[PDB]
Write an enzyme that holds these catalytic residues in place. Structure first.
Site, short mmCIF file in Angstrom:
data_model
loop_
_atom_site.label_atom_id
_atom_site.label_comp_id
_atom_site.label_asym_id
_atom_site.label_seq_id
_atom_site.Cartn_x
_atom_site.Cartn_y
_atom_site.Cartn_z
N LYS A 160 0.84 -1.22 0.00
CA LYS A 160 0.00 0.00 0.00
C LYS A 160 0.87 1.26 0.00
O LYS A 160 0.46 2.28 -0.51
CB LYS A 160 -0.88 0.08 1.28
CG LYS A 160 -2.00 -0.95 1.37
CD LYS A 160 -2.86 -0.72 2.61
CE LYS A 160 -3.33 -2.01 3.24
NZ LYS A 160 -4.23 -2.80 2.35
N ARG A 161 2.05 1.19 0.65
CA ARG A 161 2.97 2.31 0.78
C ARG A 161 3.80 2.53 -0.48
O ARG A 161 4.35 3.61 -0.65
CB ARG A 161 3.89 2.12 2.01
CG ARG A 161 3.17 1.91 3.34
CD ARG A 161 2.14 3.00 3.65
NE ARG A 161 1.25 2.62 4.75
CZ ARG A 161 -0.05 2.91 4.80
NH1 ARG A 161 -0.63 3.59 3.82
NH2 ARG A 161 -0.78 2.52 5.84
N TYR A 162 3.85 1.53 -1.36
CA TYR A 162 4.65 1.56 -2.58
C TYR A 162 3.84 1.27 -3.84
O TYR A 162 4.12 0.33 -4.58
CB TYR A 162 5.89 0.65 -2.45
CG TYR A 162 6.96 1.26 -1.57
CD1 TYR A 162 7.80 2.27 -2.05
CD2 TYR A 162 7.13 0.85 -0.25
CE1 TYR A 162 8.77 2.85 -1.25
CE2 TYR A 162 8.13 1.40 0.56
CZ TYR A 162 8.94 2.41 0.06
OH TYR A 162 9.89 3.02 0.85
N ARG A 163 2.84 2.12 -4.09
CA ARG A 163 2.01 2.04 -5.29
C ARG A 163 2.94 2.20 -6.51
O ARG A 163 3.82 3.06 -6.50
CB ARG A 163 0.96 3.15 -5.28
CG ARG A 163 -0.14 2.92 -6.31
CD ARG A 163 -1.14 4.06 -6.38
NE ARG A 163 -2.15 3.80 -7.42
CZ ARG A 163 -2.60 4.72 -8.27
NH1 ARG A 163 -2.15 5.97 -8.22
NH2 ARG A 163 -3.50 4.39 -9.18
N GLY A 186 24.15 5.09 2.53
CA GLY A 186 25.37 4.50 3.11
C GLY A 186 25.09 3.35 4.07
O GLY A 186 26.02 2.68 4.52
N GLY A 189 23.20 -2.73 2.34
CA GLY A 189 24.04 -3.92 2.47
C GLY A 189 24.16 -4.40 3.90
O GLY A 189 24.49 -5.57 4.14
N1 LIG Z 1 15.28 4.52 3.53
C1 LIG Z 1 15.85 3.28 3.00
C2 LIG Z 1 17.33 3.40 2.60
C3 LIG Z 1 17.55 4.40 1.48
C4 LIG Z 1 19.04 4.53 1.10
C5 LIG Z 1 19.65 3.17 0.73
C6 LIG Z 1 21.14 3.30 0.42
O1 LIG Z 1 21.99 3.34 1.31
N2 LIG Z 1 21.44 3.29 -0.88
C7 LIG Z 1 22.82 3.20 -1.34
C8 LIG Z 1 22.87 2.77 -2.81
C9 LIG Z 1 24.28 2.70 -3.33
C10 LIG Z 1 25.18 1.76 -2.83
C11 LIG Z 1 26.51 1.77 -3.22
C12 LIG Z 1 26.96 2.70 -4.13
C13 LIG Z 1 26.09 3.65 -4.62
C14 LIG Z 1 24.76 3.65 -4.23
C15 LIG Z 1 23.58 4.47 -1.13
N3 LIG Z 1 24.77 4.57 -0.56
C16 LIG Z 1 25.12 5.90 -0.70
C17 LIG Z 1 26.41 6.40 -0.18
C18 LIG Z 1 26.60 7.77 0.03
C19 LIG Z 1 27.85 8.26 0.39
C20 LIG Z 1 28.92 7.39 0.60
C21 LIG Z 1 30.27 8.01 0.95
N4 LIG Z 1 31.29 7.20 1.21
O2 LIG Z 1 30.39 9.26 0.98
C22 LIG Z 1 28.71 6.03 0.43
C23 LIG Z 1 27.48 5.54 0.03
C24 LIG Z 1 24.13 6.58 -1.35
N5 LIG Z 1 23.15 5.66 -1.60
C25 LIG Z 1 19.41 2.16 1.86
C26 LIG Z 1 17.92 2.06 2.19
#
Ligand SMILES: NC[C@H]1CC[C@H](C(=O)N[C@@H](Cc2ccccc2)c2nc(-c3ccc(C(N)=O)cc3)c[nH]2)CC1
Lengths: 238, 7
Positions: A160-163, A186, A189
């Site tokens: 419901k939250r992800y239409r 960040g 994983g």
């Molecule tokens: N509400 C839920 C929540 C939303 C964010 C998602 C996330 O965590 N998504 C990652 C997807 C990604 C992984 C690896 C590489 C690139 C993208 C991300 N990590 C960063 C990130 C940002 C700065 C740094 C850094 N070292 O400055 C490292 C990773 C931005 N987004 C987790 C779930």
């Protein structure tokens, strides 16, 4: 992690920080120790990672400032991505890192139990998300490992939250209806760890969501119980 | 752990 608090040293000893050295060394993703040569993490972490040679796994870390050029780490021999994986929003967001050397277990670093197939019906009420991710939408990687207790949401309620998305039974959601506590940039994983009968179980892997800690937008996680046979296939190969 | 990971 949004709306969390600093962890104490040794509180989440299965939690690892995965760094990339390309172009410069930085935290890439969280991960969990599940065996003495195995890290479980998200497949989306490895977008554009052409070789495991650029990766460094750091265990027994509370603060990112503990990491310098002289800090010991585990090299990665192999990146195993689920072969049905296309993108986080479509599921199969799961990967294994086979380490070059064996993790010596102790009070600072040890594995978390995987869920039991029999426990697919158990109701987890003590679930925590951890990581060094942002504390708000526009932020930076945190020095101290953060934690937040978040309730699990049913697949029906998450849908419901992800239409417009398809929330599958290989996904599990967690978050408060009013928002406020969630994983953020960040934290992906890393583990969604749930305590049941005094034992911690790796219930989810932080995967994706719409923004961070927004009202009616729970975090979406890989549902680890649905991948226990895949993990054993990859880790117990003859 | 009930689920065993081989060393
Ligand atoms: N509400 C839920 C929540 C939303 C964010 C998602 C996330 O965590 N998504 C990652 C997807 C990604 C992984 C690896 C590489 C690139 C993208 C991300 N990590 C960063 C990130 C940002 C700065 C740094 C850094 N070292 O400055 C490292 C990773 C931005 N987004 C987790 C779930």
């Amino acid at each position: 992690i949004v709306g969390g608090t600093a962890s104490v040293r040794g509180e989440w000893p299965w939690q690892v920080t995965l760094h990339t050295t390309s172009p410069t060394q930085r935290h890439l993703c969280g991960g969990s120790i599940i065996g003495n040569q195995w890290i479980l993490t998200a497949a989306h972490c490895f977008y554009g990672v052409e070789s495991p040679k650029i990766l460094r796994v750091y265990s027994g870390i509370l603060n990112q400032s503990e990491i310098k050029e002289d800090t010991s780490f585990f090299g990665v021999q192999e990146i195993i991505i689920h072969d049905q994986y296309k993108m986080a929003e479509s599921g199969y967001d799961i990967a294994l890192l086979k380490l070059e050397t064996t993790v010596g277990y102790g009070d600072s670093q040890r594995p978390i139990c995987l869920p039991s197939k029999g426990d697919r019906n158990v109701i987890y009420t003590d679930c925590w998300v951890t990581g060094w991710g942002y504390r708000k939408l526009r932020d930076k990687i945190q020095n101290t490992l953060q934690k937040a207790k978040i309730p699990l949401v049913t697949n029906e309620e998450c849908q419901k939250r992800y239409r417009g998305h398809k929330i599958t039974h290989k996904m599990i959601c967690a978050g408060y209806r009013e928002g406020g506590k969630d994983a953020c940039k960040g934290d992906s994983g890393g583990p969604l760890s749930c305590k049941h009968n005094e034992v911690w179980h790796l219930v989810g892997i932080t995967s994706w969501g719409e923004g961070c800690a927004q009202r009616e937008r729970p975090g979406v996680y890989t549902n680890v119980v649905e991948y226990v046979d895949w993990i054993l296939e990859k880790t117990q190969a003859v | 752990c009930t689920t065993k990971i081989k060393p």
